[PDB]
Amino acid sequence: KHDYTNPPWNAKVPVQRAMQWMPISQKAGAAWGVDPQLITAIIAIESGGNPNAVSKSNAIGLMQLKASTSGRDVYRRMGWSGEPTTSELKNPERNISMGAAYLNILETGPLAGIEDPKVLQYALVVSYANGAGALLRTFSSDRKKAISKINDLDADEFLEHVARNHPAPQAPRFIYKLEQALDAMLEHHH
Known part of the structure; x- marks a missing residue:
């Protein structure tokens, strides 16, 4: 239903700029066990490689972290009180490392406990934007059953499901731009 x-969307130029940051993204991805292409994909989608991007919501920088939510979430993962400042989120290394x-x-x-790497990947990009909870909720009210229901899908049916079920239009959109972005990235030798 979501068109x-x-x-x-032409990935080329936004991935080109996103790729400016790929050395950091490589290091960040390595350290946290995250696909560096995904990081770069997200930078390209969320900020188009512009480290000073600032949303209506006051999400900040290359990966559009919001200090009160994802910022706070990452601060707690590292044993830290409080939230990162705007200033620290505009730093490209801190920002990417935090994404x-x-x-x-x-x-x-x-x-x-998602099996398929590719669905995992799609789930990440939709979660990143519009929240893991809202995604699971489109499957079932209970987490564990929603996850079993996700593992009964391959990536394309997952995209179809998000397209028809997710309230947020930008959820499936992100999966489309992920794939455009990965395509632009084959023209960049790792």
């Missing part, structure tokens, strides 16, 4: 491929942490948090928490 999620319209308009088309990586946050992706790791989603993978080892809300989304734990």
